[PDB]
Amino acid sequence: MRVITLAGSPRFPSRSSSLLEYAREKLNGLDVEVYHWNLQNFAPEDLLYARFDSPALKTFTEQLQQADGLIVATPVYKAAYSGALKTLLDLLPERALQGKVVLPLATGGTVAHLLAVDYALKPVLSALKAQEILHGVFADDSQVIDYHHRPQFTPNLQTRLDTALETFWQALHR
Amino acid sequence: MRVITLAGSPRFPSRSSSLLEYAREKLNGLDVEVYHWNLQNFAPEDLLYARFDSPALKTFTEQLQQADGLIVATPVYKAAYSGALKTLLDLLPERALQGKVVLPLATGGTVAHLLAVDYALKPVLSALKAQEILHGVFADDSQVIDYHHRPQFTPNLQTRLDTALETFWQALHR
Amino acid sequence: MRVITLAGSPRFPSRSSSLLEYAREKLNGLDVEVYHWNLQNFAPEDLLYARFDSPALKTFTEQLQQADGLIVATPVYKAAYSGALKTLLDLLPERALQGKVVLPLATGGTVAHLLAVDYALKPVLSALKAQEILHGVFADDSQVIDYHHRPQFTPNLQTRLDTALETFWQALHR
Amino acid sequence: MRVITLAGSPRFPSRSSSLLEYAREKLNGLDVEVYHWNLQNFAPEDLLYARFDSPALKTFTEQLQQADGLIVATPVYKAAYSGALKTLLDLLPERALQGKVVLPLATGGTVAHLLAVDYALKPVLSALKAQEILHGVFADDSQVIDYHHRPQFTPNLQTRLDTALETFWQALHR
Ligand SMILES: Cc1cc2nc3c(=O)[nH]c(=O)nc-3n(C[C@H](O)[C@H](O)[C@H](O)COP(=O)(O)O)c2cc1C
Numbered sequence: 001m002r003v004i005t006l007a008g009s010p011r012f013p014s015r016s017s018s019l020l021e022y023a024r025e026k027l028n029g030l031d032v033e034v035y036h037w038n039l040q041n042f043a044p045e046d047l048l049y050a051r052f053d054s055p056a057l058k059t060f061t062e063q064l065q066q067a068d069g070l071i072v073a074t075p076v077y078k079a080a081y082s083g084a085l086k087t088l089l090d091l092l093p094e095r096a097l098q099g100k101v102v103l104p105l106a107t108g109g110t111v112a113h114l115l116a117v118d119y120a121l122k123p124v125l126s127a128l129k130a131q132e133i134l135h136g137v138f139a140d141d142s143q144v145i146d147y148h149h150r151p152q153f154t155p156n157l158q159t160r161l162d163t164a165l166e167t168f169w170q171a172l173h174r
Numbered sequence: 175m176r177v178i179t180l181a182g183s184p185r186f187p188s189r190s191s192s193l194l195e196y197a198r199e200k201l202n203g204l205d206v207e208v209y210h211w212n213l214q215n216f217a218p219e220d221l222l223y224a225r226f227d228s229p230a231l232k233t234f235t236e237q238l239q240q241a242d243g244l245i246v247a248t249p250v251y252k253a254a255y256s257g258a259l260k261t262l263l264d265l266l267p268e269r270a271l272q273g274k275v276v277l278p279l280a281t282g283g284t285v286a287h288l289l290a291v292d293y294a295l296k297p298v299l300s301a302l303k304a305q306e307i308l309h310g311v312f313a314d315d316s317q318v319i320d321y322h323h324r325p326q327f328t329p330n331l332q333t334r335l336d337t338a339l340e341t342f343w344q345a346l347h348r
Numbered sequence: 349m350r351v352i353t354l355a356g357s358p359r360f361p362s363r364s365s366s367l368l369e370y371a372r373e374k375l376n377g378l379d380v381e382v383y384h385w386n387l388q389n390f391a392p393e394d395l396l397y398a399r400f401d402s403p404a405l406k407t408f409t410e411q412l413q414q415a416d417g418l419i420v421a422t423p424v425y426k427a428a429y430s431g432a433l434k435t436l437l438d439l440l441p442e443r444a445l446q447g448k449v450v451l452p453l454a455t456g457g458t459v460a461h462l463l464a465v466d467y468a469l470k471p472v473l474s475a476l477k478a479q480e481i482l483h484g485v486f487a488d489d490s491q492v493i494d495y496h497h498r499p500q501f502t503p504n505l506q507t508r509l510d511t512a513l514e515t516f517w518q519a520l521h522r
Numbered sequence: 523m524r525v526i527t528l529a530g531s532p533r534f535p536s537r538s539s540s541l542l543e544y545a546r547e548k549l550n551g552l553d554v555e556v557y558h559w560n561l562q563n564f565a566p567e568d569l570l571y572a573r574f575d576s577p578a579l580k581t582f583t584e585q586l587q588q589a590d591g592l593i594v595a596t597p598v599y600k601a602a603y604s605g606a607l608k609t610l611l612d613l614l615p616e617r618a619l620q621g622k623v624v625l626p627l628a629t630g631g632t633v634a635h636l637l638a639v640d641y642a643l644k645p646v647l648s649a650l651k652a653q654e655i656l657h658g659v660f661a662d663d664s665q666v667i668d669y670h671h672r673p674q675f676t677p678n679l680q681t682r683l684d685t686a687l688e689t690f691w692q693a694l695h696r
């Protein structure tokens with residue numbers, strides 16, 4: 001009944017965030033409570049110098065603890081997740097994702113870096129003890145037609161996202 | 175209702191196999207179809223020369239097709255899964271694990287190679303399109319009291335196996 | 349002064365092998381000891397059942413011992429190196445690549461799996477203690493004009509092979 | 523003749539930085555010019571919001587371009603490099619490490635995460651086009667006796683660092 005959507009892009013507007021926006025609306029439609037976070041919710045110095053007393057982190061940690069699921073989105077930066085997202089994940093307590101379903105989403109400039117999700121991001125989410133990690137959705141930039149005014153995807157990206165979200169919603173029932 | 179267990183060790187008796195035998199004892203007490211396979215059930219020339227016509231391969235793929243879950247165990251060889259296991263995995267169809275929940279297990283000579291499960295094995299299981307990959311269990315060789323005569327594990331390893339199997343069991347029901 | 353080239357494809361003729369044949373043509377014009385091996389040079393039962401007494405294994409290990417560099421090529425299977433190649437790699441001694449410079453090459457059905465080289469193959473070569481691992485070359489199947497009758501590559505792939513081999517050549521001299 | 527040492531830890535004093543300090547002194551002794559950077563050299567907001575016009579980044583980019591080699595150190599955070607270090611690496615231009623020798627160093631709370639170097643950090647350094655990546659040195663925290671007042675390591679850590687640094691220095695000669 002409660003889901004956190006987390007945007008890992010440092011820019012605004014963000015292509016990977018449009019996937020999260022589409023996800024939010026589907027989940028709202030199914031009467032799931034969705035709480036959206038992004039890196040602007042945190043003081044940069046708190047993130048970079050890994051300062052655990054951050055008030056926003058406290059709120060975020062508390063909200064995560066109460067969430068049944070997490071949807072996390074990232075750009076591919078240098079064949080991995082964004083450093084910006086990792087600075088926040090690094091501040092989460094050990095076992096932060098224990099008992100939780102996790103759906104990872106990424107967008108990349110080249111399809112050449114599709115494996116960044118499986119080989120880089122999933123291992124960090126598992127280190128946080130995610131109970132289940134879903135297959136995820138990678139899309140290269142050309143598959144997101146609009147991320148500035150209204151999330152618009154090619155039909156194949158939209159179908160893969162629909163499939164992922166259905167699987168995630170079914171998972172939230174245990 | 176149906177589960178495949180797959181041992182990936184080239185040798186026998188095997189530590190990683192004794193892990194699967196323990197899983198089966200726990201599932202045999204729950205009215206389940208458990209189908210067990212090892213690398214011995216296939217011809218070495220079929221596996222090394224990637225022969226798709228292989229008769230055991232056909233049997234295995236059909237059984238896998240109708241199964242709802244997979245538990246697969248490997249030794250850690252050169253900081254990854256065994257080459258032997260991978261020759262079989264390479265022969266499965268592109269989407270062989272689609273819609274199935276997967277539980278990876280491994281044994282390793284040193285705790286220093288614990289991450290072989292998250293960074294090497296899981297991306298291959300994801301390439302096969304696993305719907306959900308569970309956290310899994312790594313056991314280092316210090317934890318296997320006996321694997322020749324029957325599974326005997328130190329208490330820390332048993333609790334972790336027990337926990338993973340509960341999750342696997344619960345995950346199978348949807 | 350001495351180099352091992354190692355083909356990791358279970359099949360022949362092979363795309364990834366045609367890459368190694370091109371390397372050898374370039375090194376044959378530089379007064380070099382080049383020693384070439386493939387998975388056919390070993391018995392399938394030895395490799396699948398991890399037999400350390402293997403007679404070809406012994407020959408290979410000695411030759412590898414005195415060699416200054418290694419060029420190894422693999423197809424991409426299930427988002428990683430071939431299982432077939434890995435069965436041989438699993439049989440080498442713990443520090444087999446110590447003090448040697450290594451050049452990894454791969455071929456893949458899609459550019460989407462380019463990262464299999466950095467995330468899957470290189471950590472195994474590092475487990476074998478390679479002194480230096482070079483950047484390497486991934487070639488997708490679109491770039492191999494012919495591999496049956498002789499190596500024929502699109503110009504983009506040839507320039508990249510040429511560059512990697514220059515680095516490998518230069519690296520061998522210390 | 524010019525080397526950049528880069529500290530990826532967000533804290534001060536840093537255990538992984540003591541390795542870099544030991545490296546600096548060895549290299550100074552061999553009349554190499556060593557330029558040390560850490561994350562405090564950058565405004566946090568420039569790092570987090572990936573702002574390429576950062577004056578410090580300009581200076582850092584220019585110094586890196588002129589360097590023959592790079593030594594980069596990181597703590598293991600969540601089974602990978604630090605996010606803080608990744609935010610800086612993310613701001614480097616494509617091909618930033620082309621033509622350069624790279625020695626990666628890491629310290630981790632548990633030996634269980636030794637593979638974080640091979641499987642997480644090296645692929646990012648390769649994405650930046652490093653010409654050669656050395657084996658590297660991982661050490662769990664217990665091997666660094668002092669990082670507050672004077673870098674002091676166990677004899678085995680000190681020997682592995684000496685070996686790595688010799689290899690790096692030899693490499694700087696091409
Ligand atoms: C600093 C930076 C580094 C990037 N590195 C990569 C890369 O290594 N591989 C890739 O496929 N795309 C790379 N890109 C492109 C982004 O992944 C891509 O444009 C993405 O959709 C941006 O998502 P966002 O708008 O949510 O930030 C990079 C972009 C930036 C700004």
Ligand SMILES: Cc1cc2nc3c(=O)[nH]c(=O)nc-3n(C[C@H](O)[C@H](O)[C@H](O)COP(=O)(O)O)c2cc1C
Pocket residue numbers: 078108109110141612614615616
């Ligand atoms: C494969 C690829 C890799 C990239 N790597 C970087 C990078 O490393 N650093 C950077 O500033 N931009 C990088 N870019 C550029 C960004 O993607 C840039 O923000 C984008 O091209 C501008 O278009 P956009 O705003 O619509 O995403 C990369 C782009 C691609 C396609």
Ligand SMILES: Cc1cc2nc3c(=O)[nH]c(=O)nc-3n(C[C@H](O)[C@H](O)[C@H](O)COP(=O)(O)O)c2cc1C
Pocket residue numbers: 183184185187188189190191248249250251252253254281282283284285287315398438439475
């Ligand atoms: C060829 C070979 C290579 C191995 N390499 C590693 C290794 O890289 N890392 C590790 O932790 N253990 C390594 N080991 C130890 C095995 O992973 C360990 O003994 C494991 O329990 C074997 O399980 P099994 O009995 O099911 O074969 C290796 C063992 C063999 C036989």
Ligand SMILES: Cc1cc2nc3c(=O)[nH]c(=O)nc-3n(C[C@H](O)[C@H](O)[C@H](O)COP(=O)(O)O)c2cc1C
Pocket residue numbers: 224264265301357358359361362363364365422423424425426427428455456457458459461489
């Ligand atoms: C069993 C098998 C599995 C494969 N899986 C992948 C894959 O996961 N990703 C990919 O890019 N290509 C995959 N391919 C395509 C091969 O990587 C590609 O055709 C390669 O060039 C084979 O090289 P070879 O001729 O040396 O065997 C696969 C091919 C086979 C035969």
Ligand SMILES: Cc1cc2nc3c(=O)[nH]c(=O)nc-3n(C[C@H](O)[C@H](O)[C@H](O)COP(=O)(O)O)c2cc1C
Pocket residue numbers: 050090091127531532533535536537538539596597598599600601602629630631632633634635663
């Ligand atoms: C936020 C945070 C996360 C950490 N996560 C891990 C971890 O996943 N694995 C590990 O082995 N150590 C972990 N550690 C311990 C550090 O890797 C270790 O103490 C390291 O030596 C610190 O290096 P530094 O002093 O250079 O920052 C973590 C430490 C912190 C502060």
Ligand SMILES: Cc1cc2nc3c(=O)[nH]c(=O)nc-3n(C[C@H](O)[C@H](O)[C@H](O)COP(=O)(O)O)c2cc1C
Pocket residue numbers: 090092093094600630631632663
């Ligand atoms: C394996 C391991 C994992 C750790 N993971 C975290 C973490 O995720 N978050 C955190 O704040 N601290 C983590 N720590 C604690 C830090 O390492 C902490 O800074 C340290 O225990 C304090 O001692 P030190 O300052 O001498 O390194 C971890 C420690 C270890 C040993």
